[PDB]
Design an enzyme around this catalytic site. Structure first.
Site, short mmCIF file in Angstrom:
data_model
loop_
_atom_site.label_atom_id
_atom_site.label_comp_id
_atom_site.label_asym_id
_atom_site.label_seq_id
_atom_site.Cartn_x
_atom_site.Cartn_y
_atom_site.Cartn_z
N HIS A 72 0.90 -1.18 -0.18
CA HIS A 72 -0.03 -0.11 0.13
C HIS A 72 0.95 1.26 0.05
O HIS A 72 0.52 2.32 0.93
CB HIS A 72 -0.84 -0.09 1.35
CG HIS A 72 -2.26 -0.98 1.19
ND1 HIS A 72 -2.03 -2.34 1.69
CD2 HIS A 72 -3.29 -1.20 0.22
CE1 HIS A 72 -3.12 -3.07 1.44
NE2 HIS A 72 -3.67 -2.33 0.47
N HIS A 112 -6.91 7.00 -2.89
CA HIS A 112 -7.79 6.07 -2.23
C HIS A 112 -6.99 5.30 -0.98
O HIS A 112 -7.89 4.51 -0.28
CB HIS A 112 -8.50 5.15 -3.14
CG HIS A 112 -7.72 3.77 -3.40
ND1 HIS A 112 -6.63 3.75 -4.16
CD2 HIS A 112 -7.85 2.68 -3.05
CE1 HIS A 112 -6.16 2.50 -4.31
NE2 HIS A 112 -6.86 1.83 -3.41
N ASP A 113 -5.68 5.11 -0.87
CA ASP A 113 -5.14 4.56 0.00
C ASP A 113 -4.07 5.37 0.83
O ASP A 113 -2.84 4.91 1.30
CB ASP A 113 -4.35 3.24 -0.53
CG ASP A 113 -5.20 1.98 -0.45
OD1 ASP A 113 -6.29 1.94 0.57
OD2 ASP A 113 -4.88 1.04 -1.18
N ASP A 230 -9.25 -1.45 -7.93
CA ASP A 230 -8.44 -2.01 -6.91
C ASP A 230 -8.16 -3.53 -6.64
O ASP A 230 -7.03 -4.03 -6.07
CB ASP A 230 -9.34 -1.29 -5.68
CG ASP A 230 -8.41 -1.32 -4.39
OD1 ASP A 230 -8.90 -1.65 -3.29
OD2 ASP A 230 -7.20 -0.89 -4.55
N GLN A 281 -4.08 -17.10 -3.51
CA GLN A 281 -4.16 -16.52 -4.53
C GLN A 281 -5.80 -17.00 -5.21
O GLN A 281 -6.49 -16.34 -5.99
CB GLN A 281 -3.23 -16.29 -5.67
CG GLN A 281 -2.38 -14.99 -4.98
CD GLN A 281 -3.01 -13.74 -4.80
OE1 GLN A 281 -3.85 -13.20 -5.84
NE2 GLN A 281 -2.67 -13.17 -3.75
N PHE A 284 -8.72 -16.22 -3.43
CA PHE A 284 -8.89 -14.84 -3.69
C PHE A 284 -9.52 -14.46 -5.20
O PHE A 284 -10.61 -14.01 -5.24
CB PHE A 284 -7.40 -13.91 -3.62
CG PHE A 284 -7.69 -12.35 -3.90
CD1 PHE A 284 -8.41 -11.69 -3.23
CD2 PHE A 284 -6.80 -11.76 -4.83
CE1 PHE A 284 -8.78 -10.38 -3.38
CE2 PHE A 284 -6.98 -10.41 -4.87
CZ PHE A 284 -7.57 -9.47 -4.00
C1 LIG Z 1 -2.37 -9.98 -5.22
O1 LIG Z 1 -3.21 -10.19 -4.31
C2 LIG Z 1 -4.01 -9.26 -3.41
C3 LIG Z 1 -4.11 -7.76 -3.97
C4 LIG Z 1 -4.76 -6.96 -3.20
C5 LIG Z 1 -5.52 -7.38 -2.16
C6 LIG Z 1 -6.20 -6.42 -1.14
C7 LIG Z 1 -7.75 -7.14 -0.93
N1 LIG Z 1 -5.56 -6.04 0.05
O2 LIG Z 1 -5.91 -6.38 1.02
C8 LIG Z 1 -7.13 -5.38 1.47
N2 LIG Z 1 -7.91 -5.87 2.45
O3 LIG Z 1 -7.54 -4.17 1.27
C9 LIG Z 1 -5.42 -8.70 -1.62
C10 LIG Z 1 -4.67 -9.69 -2.10
O4 LIG Z 1 -4.50 -11.04 -1.88
C11 LIG Z 1 -4.92 -11.37 -0.53
C12 LIG Z 1 -3.39 -12.04 -0.01
C13 LIG Z 1 -3.75 -13.54 -0.29
C14 LIG Z 1 -5.10 -13.71 -0.73
C15 LIG Z 1 -5.90 -12.53 -0.67
MG LIG Z 2 -7.53 0.58 0.55
ZN LIG Z 3 -6.04 -0.04 -2.49
#
Ligand SMILES: COc1ccc(/C(C)=N/OC(N)=O)cc1OC1CCCC1
Ligand SMILES: [Mg+2]
Ligand SMILES: [Zn+2]
EC number: 3.1.4.53
Length: 323
Positions: A72, A112-113, A230, A281, A284
């Site tokens: 981030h 946004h972050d 995002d 992943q 996800f």
């Molecule tokens: C490349 O993978 C990701 C990219 C972005 C995110 C986002 C959701 N980051 O976290 C939050 N809650 O903002 C989350 C990701 O993966 C997470 C970590 C393992 C599976 C979910």
């Molecule tokens: Mg965020």
């Molecule tokens: Zn973000």
């Protein structure tokens, strides 16, 4: 330099490689990409925003993302902004948005972050952090990102919206708050359910362009567009997606380390000694990213089919890495 211009030739493309732009911009990817995007869309001319003022704001904003946070940081903001810039040009959305809406979505993606500390809302709530006390446990980080981004607009030498109308500033502010608050993952299911309902009652012109009646429908699409941007990492090339995965796991595992130190319960996907990067992943993609993008694709079909194909391929690669 010459490398930067070459990379920026893909500004309007999904294949743009933001890591490359960061390397050639003195670690100011956000500032550089925001400037390129605003020039491409003539937003500086349209909203009478001085270049000096815009750069000062963008550089200050960028410096407010934390360089020691793995995921981030300003590179992610720069990636979300560029991705939003591409989505806004989807053929199905042609001429649906006003210039003010276009301006708000990209601005929203940039901020946004901002000032993200590299730990989750839940971590901030469980450790009784000052941020959680301030925001009464609700969308803690996201209210914070907005507060900082809008706070920075308060100095005359940083107010890029100075020349907007009073009503225009109110509308933009309302839209931006809406969009950033929608990036809070705890609202994901609710956002997705509402997107599926908009797809259900989707209406178009004869030429395949969405018809969005009121402000309500337009802002719902913009909220969802920023949320897809995002969650766009798994829809990019495998080379880009893997670098993004490495960064989020580094951030998550560092959170787990902080949790362990303090004798707290370790969040499962944040536990370096047990969590499978690959399995995580796949989950996800299956439970969050794909269902969202499948729904986005339906809304703008067939503009996002290539994104969906890349997503499936990336999913299967991570799956093939799991024994
Ligand atoms: C490349 O993978 C990701 C990219 C972005 C995110 C986002 C959701 N980051 O976290 C939050 N809650 O903002 C989350 C990701 O993966 C997470 C970590 C393992 C599976 C979910
Ligand atoms: Mg965020
Ligand atoms: Zn973000």
């Amino acid at each position: 330099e010459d490398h930067l211009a070459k990379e920026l030739e893909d500004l309007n493309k999904w294949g743009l490689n933001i890591f490359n732009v960061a390397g050639y911009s003195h670690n100011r990817p956000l500032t550089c990409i925001m400037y390129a995007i605003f020039q491409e869309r003539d937003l500086l001319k349209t909203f009478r925003i001085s270049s000096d003022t815009f750069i000062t704001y963008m550089m200050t904003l960028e410096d407010h993302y934390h360089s020691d946070v793995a995921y981030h940081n300003s590179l992610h903001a720069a990636d979300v902004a560029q991705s939003t810039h591409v989505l806004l040009s989807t053929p199905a959305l042609d001429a649906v948005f006003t210039d003010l809406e276009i301006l708000a979505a990209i601005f929203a993606a940039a901020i946004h972050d901002v000032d993200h500390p590299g730990v989750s809302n839940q971590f901030l709530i469980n450790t009784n952090s000052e941020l959680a006390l301030m925001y009464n446990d609700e969308s803690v980080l996201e209210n914070h990102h907005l507060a900082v981004g809008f706070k920075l607009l308060q100095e005359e030498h940083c107010d890029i919206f100075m020349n907007l109308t009073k009503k225009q500033r109110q509308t933009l502010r309302k839209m931006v708050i809406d969009m950033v608050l929608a990036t809070d993952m705890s609202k994901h299911m609710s956002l997705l359910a509402d997107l599926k309902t908009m797809v259900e009652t989707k209406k178009v012109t004869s030429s395949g362009v969405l018809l969005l009646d009121n402000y309500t429908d337009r802002i719902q699409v913009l909220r969802n567009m920023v949320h897809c941007a995002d969650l766009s990492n798994p829809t990019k090339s495998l080379e880009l997606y893997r670098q993004w995965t490495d960064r989020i796991m580094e951030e998550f595992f560092q959170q787990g380390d902080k949790e362990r130190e303090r004798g707290m319960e370790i969040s499962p996907m944040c536990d370096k000694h047990t969590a499978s990067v690959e399995k995580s992943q796949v989950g996800f993609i299956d439970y969050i990213v794909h269902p969202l993008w499948e729904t986005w694709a339906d809304l703008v079909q067939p503009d996002a089919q290539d994104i969906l194909d890349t997503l499936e391929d990336n999913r299967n690669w991570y799956q093939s890495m799991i024994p």
